[PDB]
């Protein structure tokens, strides 16, 4: 239910759209 | 599409 809005990061948070 | 590594959300 989440879609990345930017590259995912190792051991760190990143931005997602929900749904 | 993934499902709930570390996530903030806009």
């Amino acid at each position, epitope marked *: 239910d989440i879609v*990345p*809005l*930017e*590259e995912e990061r*190792k*051991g760190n948070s990143s931005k997602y*759209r929900l749904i | *599409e*993934e499902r709930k590594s570390k996530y903030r959300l*806009i």
Partner: antibody, heavy 119, light 112 residues
């Protein structure tokens, strides 16, 4: 496994601006992000930059001042402009975009377009 | 700047395990994911390993990835070497600004 298709002028004169676009087929053009990479003939991969859905851009520090990336998802257009090209910019330019199935994502690249800088 | 160095050339005869290392010159290897790309003649690079040690479904299970904090390096391991494994391999990771950086590439030759 995305079908990414790069297109551009083939030949660019030295000092002019190299312009490329990329479109995606077989997936959605929304969300995620878009990257450019190049490979001069007979050499290694060199990253150029990335633009993501938040609007943020990232550029190779050694090309920063010459590179502009943009994306229009309604047109299905991922764009690169590289200014003041020289012979060193002759390369295959690849578009890359994550291929995403339920629960899994990893980068998929187009087959590249060769751009030659020559008079 | 941050650099990822690779051996210029790795080779093995069929059946061997070969490894290709990817040494980060500055900052911690563990700080950002490491990807491995394979390139065959006339085609674009394809992921064989991502996020340090994940493998796409169509990539043989003979391929695997690892991270070694003490040498600050990542390794791609190819077990039971086969002729079709012959190719160029590049590692790819990121620096502290989230810029991609590619290693310089390794030619893998399958002997005999």
């Amino acid at each position: 496994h995305l079908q990414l298709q790069e297109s551009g002028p083939g030949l660019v004169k030295p000092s002019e601006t190299l312009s490329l676009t990329c479109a995606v087929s077989g997936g959605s053009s929304s969300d995620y992000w878009w990257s450019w990479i190049r490979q001069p003939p007979g050499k290694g991969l060199e990253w150029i930059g990335r633009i993501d859905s938040i609007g943020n851009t990232y550029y190779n520090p050694s090309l920063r001042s010459r590179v502009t990336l943009s994306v229009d998802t309604s047109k299905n257009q991922f764009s690169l402009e590289l200014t003041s090209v020289t012979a060193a910019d002759t390369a295959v330019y690849y578009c890359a975009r994550p291929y995403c199935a339920i629960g899994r994502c990893y980068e998929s690249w187009g087959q590249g377009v060769l751009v030659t800088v020559s008079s | 700047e941050v650099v990822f160095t690779q051996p210029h050339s790795v080779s093995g005869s069929p059946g061997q395990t070969v490894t290709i290392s990817c040494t980060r010159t500055s900052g911690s290897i563990d700080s950002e994911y490491v990807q491995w790309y394979q390139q065959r003649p006339g085609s674009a690079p394809t992921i064989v390993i991502y996020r340090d040690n994940q493998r796409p479904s169509g990539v043989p299970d003979r391929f695997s990835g690892s991270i070694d904090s003490s040498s600050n390096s990542a390794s791609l391991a190819i077990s039971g070497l086969k002729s079709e494994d012959e190719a160029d391999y590049y590692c790819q990771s990121s620096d502290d600004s989230y810029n991609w950086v590619f290693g310089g590439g390794t030619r893998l030759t399958v002997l005999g």
